[model samples]
Target: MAKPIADDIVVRQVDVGETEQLMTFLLAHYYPEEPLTAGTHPPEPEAADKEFLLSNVPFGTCFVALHEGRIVAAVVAGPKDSHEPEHMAEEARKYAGGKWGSILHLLSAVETATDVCRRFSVPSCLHVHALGVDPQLRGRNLGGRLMETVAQRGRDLGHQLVSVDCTSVYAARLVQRLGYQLINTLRYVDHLDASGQQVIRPPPPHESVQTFVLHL
Candidate 1:
């Protein structure tokens, strides 16, 4: 059974105007701890990164968890077509050698390898692009709560499936416990550049990326 969210916290869809605030919250609590981002440590969210996040705001699928009106956790999610993997891969290539290149390439690799849309036989699905929780509030299951909200929102929006790329072992465990089926797994070391060198090396306990799906 899934754990219940703390009563003190409230979950709600992200508002259009809150994109910047949401980005700020993620910078403070999410990017610093996320395995890939933490490894590269981008000084600030890039224009493309912010654009990716903000684009989902109007879809009403993205959500935030608040404690006393302060954002503590967030999930940037929205409908994604089957062709997104190819597009993502193409976009990733353009960022090669840039600060976000490795992680972007890894994401592209995993999604392209798994091809969840075709595997699930759906034209599109609810894709959880990014999830973040306040560092100080770790172990409280806040991240899980935000995910639950996102999943329900996906279902409510008539999505036939939902997908998330778990870059951290902890995220893999979280989705597994939520009954999301593992579609595929890609080890960090297995992804290499043309020179046969590992492109991204996340720290211990986050050595692989797993793609998981939940049928709606």
Candidate 2:
């Protein structure tokens, strides 16, 4: 598999609006088919993002991984909403043109809360929302660099914890390798369309959510 473009990659925090375009561009490029996932939700398949990104960025919801001179990956974190669903809907519902209705709102509330219900703001510690890498550039060490950069920044600012919601085996392993501890499991209703059909998230034994916390 192709790995991360280390020497050619750089990590930085762009101003809210400046990063959203690149963030959306990178996320879509990586997970184009299913931009939104069971846990993490991107703005849209063709998101015309502007204020939405900056809306909560003031509280902390933006970061980008650049490969050489191009944006390749991105991460967005809020004040640890524990209610990302509601938060997501609040920001996205208005922008959703073809997609409408309270169902989206309901799911947003549920997903957001499930992800948000935690101690994301403690001294210097922070709870990460989603860290994404360009799918085309898989196997790269970018994820680690992203996590480590954030963790180090947290530590530099006198933070003690670096937290995140890990929804997949791939995500969980990334946290573990970074010395983050598995904290807890959060379960919620999720629509899965893996087998060419829409199905509810499989019960327990079926991958559940994980809270990973790294102490600095």
Candidate 3:
């Protein structure tokens, strides 16, 4: 459980195209082989990435958690106007990818109408599409710092809510500890394939998808 020194860690917004190569490199070497991605899709068994990451990193909201000058963790996000849930769903669907993209798109629509839009009264806010930490750097308190930095920036940008789709118990706990509330929790066991078998059966502790939010 190696940890970065407090003074050695720098959390900063990623410059356009600057973090692209580093991100692909980190994902190749450091991404965890987990159920959320590989479990639900084709098993290539390599550290390949979803294409949306490359397309979204230049949006100016992406950030890197640099440890001793190396990018160890990163969070990519952008603002969304939920005035029309259909548009939001389309955007989410484009990034969702894979076999269950439509399911995720529908869920995003439901999440917005049920929680984000109703609570905030306004539709504009920030949504984190991806966040990852280096496998070698677990238990280093980088997640909290990364999230806090993003939340602050969201507030500074005048967004009223910051949302995240927490696909693991690890992710749910991280946002909950940072004062985010769970808006919806979709259990994977309840999602079945066309043949009535479970679509995703992740290993223990990664059971549900939690749509979590922090009011800004």
Candidate 4:
């Protein structure tokens, strides 16, 4: 029998550990088949096998969806206004379907985003990275509520906006449903790994990725 996840799901950050399990849950099993954001659903990193999965994360910023005292869904909310090479490697792994990182190798887009955010003197902001919900618990509006919590935190900290980016259509739709606008999109072309890396996934069309912002 399929287990029923209660609607009483609570979302919060992790304690600098246990990120691997979350990775497997999101990337390996529940990425596209489930709903969260709006566009070209990016694959999971830590979830993408071993070589592709990058586990080291900034302590205390990893978020998870807890139900019945277990983590059912999870996301990364890090403070790296700068790129974390390890994190980028894992993100690229999603493209190769757990077997490639060549395409995602050059994270010019993320780097650009960080630069822009920094240029505006965009106050210290929180990044809503790697958001996922256990398909069983998705129907419960936990996604919306979790995003709200992040925005609320950003506001409380006297920041101007809460930002997030997604390569999934579900994510794009979800963020739009919450009043976020599409800022920019990147369509990777002829991207090759510096060494002998491989990126298995294709670049998402502009329609897939939707950058969102919520003003505090």
| Candidate with the greatest TM-score versus the true structure | 1
Which prediction has more favorable lDDT, 3 or 4?
3
lDDT of 1 by residue, 1-216 (tens): 122267787777788887878988988987777777766646565777768778999998888888877888889998888888888898888887765766788888887888877887888899998888887787888788888888888877888899999988888998899899998888888888778988766789898888899998
TM-scores for every candidate against the unseen true structure: 0.92, 0.62, 0.79, 0.63
Instruction: Show how many residue pairs clash in every candidate, following the order shown.
Output: 0, 18, 0, 23
Ranking by lDDT: 1, 3, 2, 4
lDDT of 3 at 57: 60
Top-lDDT candidate index: 1
lDDT (Cα, tens digit) per residue for candidate 3, span 1-216? 123437777777777658655567445543344445545555432222445455556666777777766787787787766454666566655755454463454355546545566576866768887777777876777777788878878888888888887776777888888989888777877765445766665667777778888888
Q: Which regions in candidate 4 have their CA more than 4 angstroms from the true location?
A: 1-7, 30-59, 82-103, 188-207
Clash number for model 2? Answer: 18
- The global Cα lDDT (0 to 1) of model 4 is 0.53
lDDT of each: 0.82, 0.55, 0.67, 0.53
Tell me the tens digit of each residue's lDDT in model 4 across 1-216: 122334566666665366666666665444444222111234432334233223424434456677767777666554544344355656665564422333244343444554435544664556676667777666566667667666765666566666776656667777888887566654333333455432223434423334666656
lDDT of 1 at 75: 91
In angstroms, give how far residue 187 of model 1 lies from its true place: 0.9
